[PDB]
Amino acid sequence: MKSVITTTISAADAAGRFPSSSDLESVQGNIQRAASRLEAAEKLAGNHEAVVKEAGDACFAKYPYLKNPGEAGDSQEKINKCYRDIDHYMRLINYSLVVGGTGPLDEWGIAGAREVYRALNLPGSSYIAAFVFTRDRLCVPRDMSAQAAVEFSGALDYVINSLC
Amino acid sequence: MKSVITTTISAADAAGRFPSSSDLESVQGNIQRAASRLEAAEKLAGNHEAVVKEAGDACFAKYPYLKNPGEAGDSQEKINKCYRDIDHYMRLINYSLVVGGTGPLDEWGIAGAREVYRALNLPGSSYIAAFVFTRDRLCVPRDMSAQAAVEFSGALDYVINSLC
Amino acid sequence: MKSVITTTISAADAAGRFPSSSDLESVQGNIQRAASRLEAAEKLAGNHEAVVKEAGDACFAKYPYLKNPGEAGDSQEKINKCYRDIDHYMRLINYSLVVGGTGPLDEWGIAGAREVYRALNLPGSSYIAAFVFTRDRLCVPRDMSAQAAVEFSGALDYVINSLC
Amino acid sequence: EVQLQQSGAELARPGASVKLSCKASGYTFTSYGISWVKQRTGQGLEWIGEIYPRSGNTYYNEKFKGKATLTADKSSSTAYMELRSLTSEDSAVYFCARQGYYANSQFTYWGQGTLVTVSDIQMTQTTSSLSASLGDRVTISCSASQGISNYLNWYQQKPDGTVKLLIYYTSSLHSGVPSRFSGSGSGTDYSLTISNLEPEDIATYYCQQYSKLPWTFGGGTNLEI
Amino acid sequence: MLDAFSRVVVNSDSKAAYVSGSDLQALKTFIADGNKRLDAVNSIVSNASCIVSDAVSGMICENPGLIAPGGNCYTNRRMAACLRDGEIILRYTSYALLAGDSSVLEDRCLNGLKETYIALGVPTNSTVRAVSIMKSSAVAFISNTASQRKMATADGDCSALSSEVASYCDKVSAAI
Amino acid sequence: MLDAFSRVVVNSDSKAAYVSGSDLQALKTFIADGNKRLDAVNSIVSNASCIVSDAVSGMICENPGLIAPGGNCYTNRRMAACLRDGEIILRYTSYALLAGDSSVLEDRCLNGLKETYIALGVPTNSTVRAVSIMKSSAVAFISNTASQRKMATADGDCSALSSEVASYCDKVSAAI
Amino acid sequence: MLDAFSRVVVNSDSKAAYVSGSDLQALKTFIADGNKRLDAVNSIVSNASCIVSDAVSGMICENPGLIAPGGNCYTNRRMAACLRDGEIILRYTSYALLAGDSSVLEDRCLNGLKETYIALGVPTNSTVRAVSIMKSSAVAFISNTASQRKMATADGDCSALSSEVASYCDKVSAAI
Ligand SMILES: *[C@@H](C)[C@H]1/C(=C/C2=NC(=C\c3[nH]c(C[C@H]4NC(=O)C(C=C)=C4C)c(C)c3CCC(=O)O)/C(CCC(=O)O)=C2C)NC(=O)[C@@H]1C
Ligand SMILES: *[C@@H](C)[C@H]1/C(=C/C2=NC(=C\c3[nH]c(C[C@H]4NC(=O)C(C=C)=C4C)c(C)c3CCC(=O)O)/C(CCC(=O)O)=C2C)NC(=O)[C@@H]1C
Ligand SMILES: *[C@@H](C)[C@H]1/C(=C/C2=NC(=C\c3[nH]c(C[C@H]4NC(=O)C(C=C)=C4C)c(C)c3CCC(=O)O)/C(CCC(=O)O)=C2C)NC(=O)[C@@H]1C
Ligand SMILES: *[C@H](C)[C@H]1/C(=C/C2=NC(=C\c3[nH]c(C[C@H]4NC(=O)C(C=C)=C4C)c(C)c3CCC(=O)O)/C(CCC(=O)O)=C2C)NC(=O)[C@@H]1C
Ligand SMILES: C=CC1=C(C)[C@@H](Cc2[nH]c(/C=C3N=C(/C=C4\NC(=O)[C@H](C)[C@H]4CC)C(C)=C\3CCC(=O)O)c(CCC(=O)O)c2C)NC1=O
Ligand SMILES: C=CC1=C(C)[C@@H](Cc2[nH]c(/C=C3N=C(/C=C4\NC(=O)[C@H](C)[C@H]4CC)C(C)=C\3CCC(=O)O)c(CCC(=O)O)c2C)NC1=O
Ligand SMILES: C=CC1=C(C)[C@@H](Cc2[nH]c(/C=C3N=C(/C=C4\NC(=O)[C@H](C)[C@H]4CC)C(C)=C\3CCC(=O)O)c(CCC(=O)O)c2C)NC1=O
Ligand SMILES: C=CC1=C(C)[C@@H](Cc2[nH]c(/C=C3N=C(/C=C4\NC(=O)[C@H](C)[C@H]4CC)C(C)=C\3CCC(=O)O)c(CCC(=O)O)c2C)NC1=O
Ligand SMILES: C=CC1=C(C)[C@@H](Cc2[nH]c(/C=C3N=C(/C=C4\NC(=O)[C@H](C)[C@H]4CC)C(C)=C\3CCC(=O)O)c(CCC(=O)O)c2C)NC1=O
Ligand SMILES: C=CC1=C(C)[C@@H](Cc2[nH]c(/C=C3N=C(/C=C4\NC(=O)[C@H](C)[C@H]4CC)C(C)=C\3CCC(=O)O)c(CCC(=O)O)c2C)NC1=O
Ligand SMILES: CCC1=C(C)[C@@H](CC2=N/C(=C\c3[nH]c(C[C@@H]4NC(=O)C(C)=C4CC)c(C)c3CCC(=O)O)C(CCC(=O)O)=C2C)NC1=O
Ligand SMILES: CCC1=C(C)[C@@H](CC2=N/C(=C\c3[nH]c(C[C@@H]4NC(=O)C(C)=C4CC)c(C)c3CCC(=O)O)C(CCC(=O)O)=C2C)NC1=O
Ligand SMILES: CCC1=C(C)[C@@H](CC2=N/C(=C\c3[nH]c(C[C@@H]4NC(=O)C(C)=C4CC)c(C)c3CCC(=O)O)C(CCC(=O)O)=C2C)NC1=O
């Protein structure tokens, strides 16, 4: 997974270098931003059921045509799969906050999402609606601290831009 | 110029990626360790004449054979070159402390030093003696703070290991 | 520009071969199927205004949410651009029927359509609705001969599968 | 502005041919089509056919196929209707109208009208004549044989004979139409509402579907005060 | 590539000088504004998609000849290439903003970009118009003055970072 | 590369026009003469070795300095390269004849051929002489007027294909 | 590769579970000891040359047959390769120590290392002896118990990082 540690160790290994002052400095940044990103991860992990339910409700409210026959979510099982997909993305965002990098998202939700959603007629706009609602729904300091919100919204914007 | 920022941005560019959370987090580490490494750079920059003089004196004290004809330092011009080389290395170490990485050292003192010193019969062990003396001469907190000393000694150890 | 002639000439050139029996035979296939595909092209070229209008109307009827603010086609100019896009695709299909290969479509409508439509929030399902309606709207022998219909529906299915 | 000047009234004999003309000005000729509408004496409008000069493509009402031939001249920015085998049934006033392409498929601007002497969606205007007074709010309603998708245009035909596009897409006002006019309808039933009637509104009003070819007009409702 | 710190040391190396106290103080100012710089980069990257798409759309809307036949944004392939170039330019501008130095942008995106665009027939005027729309949008996002989206940050002055983003985009426009 | 149909399409695409009735009729004429075009290509390819060898030999016979020391056909290596270049030019001319369009020949053989020959010292005059002898022999084979080789075809007029072959060879000569 | 955080994430992903409070607390402990981990990595890398040279020299001194003819450290080339991959093993061990996870070491150094050494004739016993001397020296440097080199650190207990270094070296030895 992409992260501060993996990025700098990969750069060191590509050059065949022992970890130098720059790599230790980047890991110090890991240490510094860990508080905020792990607070965001803890809040998301402890509240993901409600967050995913709200995101999916917003997705289907913005795009009621998804319920129409032949569309994604025209059956109850497909709606459950939509909420499960939002759960998967929220869990990958929790993983990204824990890791400190987009690696979990990149490798487990984004890498082939374009082809999967094209093959299964899943419009990326619905996922974008769920994630945009999740990002806008978060408020500070009620849900998390300001920097935890920064990290959480950064991961949400990352997945949104992966879908855009 | 290897640094936290340059390593991070080069890794992002190699993957065609916008700066991500881990990129900003590495730069946060730059911010966190900058105080110590810039304190070390300021102390070295403000005291480099005496430090270089001491390092060169230690190099020639440990290897008086360098004064023998045909050896490096058999003339006053060559001894001045020796001290100028130690000044070059200390300036590159000051640059590395300012940059936050070994980039300046790698590109300006290390990259071809092996071939240069082989061609000119310059024993790397004399440079190592100067840098080891400088590293062991530093006193905390008399000369600099503990973490500034850590950064300075890390740069010196990097030079020594480049010559080993 | 992918076609029978260009494909076999490219294969001959890659092997540094003069045209041989196989290449002339494939061009004979060009000669044989040209009647049907050029009939389809003539019918489409002489009736593209009505066909494009019907396809766009079907697209917006199947997806009325496109008229909602923030969606593609929430302004009259964007609706005109949707019909213009269907015009572009129908013209590229006319080009493919004339050429006898998907080359015009591949190079001018398909090559970057994924990234363009992702960037501009243009759901591929709307284009697919327009083209599926056009394919199902065609009647034999009312609008085309059977083989002309085969070629026209083949081009339409090709663009649909490029969007799927 | 858009004018679409038509040729003068031409008199012919049964079995002869008449080449009607329509010179377009004020707009790019190839950015629009040219539709031709037949109106018999005291009858409703009837779409003959449309030609798009950009491609030269012609679309004809099946009732006028071979009877009418549409050609256009991009150099002179003019369009021609050629009537063949003229009869008493062809005695009518023929209009040329600027036709939009895809979603703007509206007869936005009409010609003055050239008089000539000797599965379709049925558009029904139930009330063929309505009488009202100044300042009244009159409602003109028409029904489509099959469901259309709000693709309805309303046309004001003055007693002078000139035809103007009032409302397109069932609700959108034309460039010069005052807010007193309004339209409504979603399925098969559509209504044209004129609030605070004025003497300039004394005209015959036609609803025209452009959901499916051939384009069809309603019978028309004459509004008198 | 160089960052602000490496730029300072390169300037210092031209005179064989240890990094001076004034240059050190400028770098401490860079560090003290480091959190604001990270917020600025985050503002750009979190809105990079709409920045690039809006810039290309505005360039095309102001210059409809680009999407006409023979225009450089005509086909879907050319439009995708234009959007990709806008994304690449914004990515390197964000690299410069993160680094505090334009060396990455110049060396890895602008070196030969003008000649490449001339060879490809990419209109320089439209390219700089798109780059200027990206500049305006990115500056608004740094200043949190974007009309349709706001990013929560501690209140303060990021005008130095706005000017830095504008200067990077100006380097892009002047290079081509 | 483009063929005749793709050439018509590219011309139509410049105006965002569907392929018009006149261009359609021209392509239908191309199809109706398709069997004659295949016969012409077959005539060229079935005699390609003889065409190329005869052209290079005639170029050398009319310019004996080519095989003298310092001449560009002097050694066996230079002779083989010259015969290979003649074969390549004839092959791309036959590609153009089969395609009905010069795009393949231009882009894949004539692009940079003049500059390459200048850099190599290949004499342009002798190259065009060889290409013109190839043109004459290939035209004769199209018309079945070759003295020592006749190929059976249905009686008819292939002057259009002969003129196409001549025009492709003329494009080759004018490129260098 | 994986770090400690990505390792926790991968373990959580096996159950489709969000990172639980226990794993979160373990990662905060990893963060709370992050400065000690950086000091440990710094101690190893600042003495990497001495660690590797001392380990290879001790392996040779305890097994003099390595430098005899037919021994795997016989020539200067074999000696250089032995020192080089001792440095490589120490570098990947330091990578694991920095990452907090063995994934980088396993995947990028230990994958196929045993088979490669078997194919080359590199004696596994001597390799593990060198790796164990590196383990001892690196552990001493982590604990700042090296006799001839002391590095200033805040007083405390780095036994967890020392055990991590020992476990990475043990993974190296067990792989071969
Ligand atoms: C212009 C860019 C903005 C703006 C920026 C400010 N934010 C300030 C403080 C601040 N921001 C962060 C987050 C930032 N640093 C990081 O470590 C990362 C990610 C790795 C990011 C994205 C932090 C941690 C802080 C420090 C205190 C806090 O938590 O808020 C700030 C105050 C000055 C400063 O402390 O640097 C400003 C002005 N705010 C604006 O007004 C515009 C829109
Ligand atoms: C100038 C090139 C010639 C010439 C050509 C003609 N051949 C005619 C007809 C014709 N040729 C073929 C063979 C051709 N088509 C193929 O399928 C292939 C290979 C795959 C080849 C080589 C066919 C099948 C036909 C049609 C029926 C037949 O005659 O066998 C032809 C008549 C016009 C036409 O049908 O296109 C002509 C004039 N004949 C000449 O006089 C010169 C030397
Ligand atoms: C075992 C490895 C050592 C040891 C480690 C400890 N050092 C402690 C604190 C500490 N160390 C650093 C430097 C470290 N962090 C960085 O930012 C970098 C480089 C980028 C390095 C090399 C810092 C900043 C700190 C915190 C403040 C300070 O003391 O300077 C420490 C205390 C616990 C902790 O803070 O993590 C210990 C025990 N000391 C030992 O006894 C052995 C030999
Ligand atoms: C089987 C009998 C049909 C059917 C016939 C109808 N289609 C009608 C007209 C119509 N068809 C198209 C599309 C079709 N015509 C073309 O020229 C081409 C080829 C490029 C295609 C794909 C259009 C655009 C139209 C409108 C008028 C025209 O331009 O021809 C039609 C007339 C009434 C109407 O337009 O709704 C009918 C009833 N009936 C069926 O349900 C199947 C599909
Ligand atoms: C950890 C990785 C992971 C993800 C990131 C998601 C992504 C994902 N979604 C689907 C697949 C699906 N996803 C949806 C859900 C949706 N329907 C709607 O109304 C919307 C458009 C959309 C959510 C917004 C549907 C309906 C399917 C089933 C379609 C099918 O498999 O044929 C699939 C195919 C596998 C399957 O059958 O489930 C995958 C991999 N799922 C994963 O396992
Ligand atoms: C910024 C880059 C940079 C460096 C890092 C140094 C590196 C360096 N050193 C020397 C060259 C030299 N350096 C020394 C110095 C020494 N004599 C001793 O007693 C020791 C072995 C050694 C220092 C410990 C001497 C004596 C020479 C002269 C060449 C020679 O000895 O033949 C030269 C060649 C040019 C010259 O003659 O000065 C260079 C490039 N110089 C630079 O400009
Ligand atoms: C010859 C090549 C060629 C094509 C094949 C199409 C493809 C295409 N479409 C658009 C661009 C567009 N196309 C549409 C049309 C649509 N809106 C809707 O209601 C639907 C979802 C969709 C058709 C079904 C719209 C609205 C835009 C602009 C998007 C925006 O708002 O930025 C663009 C960008 C250039 C531009 O600004 O026009 C391109 C290249 N156009 C071409 O020039
Ligand atoms: C790191 C540096 C870097 C860049 C900045 C670009 C530079 C670049 N641009 C193009 C290629 C291109 N450049 C554009 C883009 C544009 N045409 C327009 O209408 C706009 C004005 C403009 C963007 C604003 C287009 C459309 C092409 C293709 C040329 C054509 O087909 O006409 C290409 C060739 C193929 C490609 O990779 O896209 C390259 C290398 N890419 C890079 O890797
Ligand atoms: C697709 C395009 C294409 C071509 C047409 C040629 C183009 C070409 N020709 C030559 C190379 C050459 N070109 C020739 C040929 C000639 N010298 C003569 O005396 C004649 C006038 C003339 C042919 C009629 C010779 C002899 C050389 C070698 C140059 C020399 O040794 O002087 C070379 C360099 C490598 C090589 O030897 O092949 C190339 C790339 N090859 C291709 O792939
Ligand atoms: C990332 C993984 C990685 C490593 C760990 C090494 C692994 C490795 N080592 C050797 C190569 C070798 N390995 C050694 C080293 C040794 N000889 C001894 O006496 C000791 C027991 C032992 C180390 C302690 C020697 C001497 C050879 C060459 C074998 C020979 O010449 O007999 C080779 C073959 C090519 C080369 O020289 O690089 C490889 C791939 N390299 C890597 O890139
Ligand atoms: C239909 C073709 C079309 C467009 C697309 C726009 C393109 C456009 N938007 C701009 C400017 C612009 N655009 C955005 C982005 C956008 N605005 C927001 O407030 C947010 C969050 C957005 C989500 C999409 C921003 C942030 C700005 C900067 C000013 C602003 O805050 O709006 C500018 C001015 C830049 C300049 O002059 O250099 C233009 C031309 N105009 C058009 O006619
Ligand atoms: C000894 C050096 C030498 C040669 C070799 C020739 C080369 C040569 N042959 C020609 C012309 C030429 N050459 C051929 C090919 C050839 N002829 C046939 O009739 C058949 C079937 C052939 C099998 C080899 C053809 C078909 C022509 C066209 C007219 C002809 O039939 O002669 C031409 C005229 C082309 C022009 O002027 O552009 C020349 C110069 N002459 C020489 O002095
Ligand atoms: C002549 C062939 C030769 C050698 C070389 C050594 C090799 C050697 N040194 C060791 C052990 C060892 N070696 C070092 C490194 C070294 N010692 C220091 O104290 C410092 C700072 C050093 C700089 C060079 C350290 C740090 C240790 C760990 C214990 C110690 O502090 O000495 C060990 C024990 C490791 C084990 O058993 O696994 C050995 C065998 N012995 C030999 O016979």
Shape of chain D: globular
Distance between the termini of chain A: 22 Å
CA gyration radius of chain A, whole angstroms: 18 Å
Shape of chain A: globular
Taken in chain order, the helices and strands of chain A follow as: HHHHHHHH
Tell me the strand percentage band of chain D: over 45%
By oligomeric state, this entry counts as: part of a larger assembly
Quickly count the helices of chain A: 8
- What pattern of helices and strands is seen along the backbone of chain D? EEEEEEEEEEEEEEEEEEEEEE
For the largest interface in this structure, which chains are involved and how many residues does each contribute?
A: B-E, 39 and 40 residues
Helix percentage range of chain D: under 10%
Strand content of chain A: under 5%
Query: Which small compounds were modeled alongside the protein?
Result: phycoerythrobilin, phycourobilin
Q: Can you summarize the main beta sheet of chain A? A: none
PDB class: immune system
Keywords: Phycoerythrin, antibody, scFv, immunity, immune system
Entry title: scFv antibody CL33 bound to R-phycoerythrin
Chains A, B, C: R-phycoerythrin alpha chain
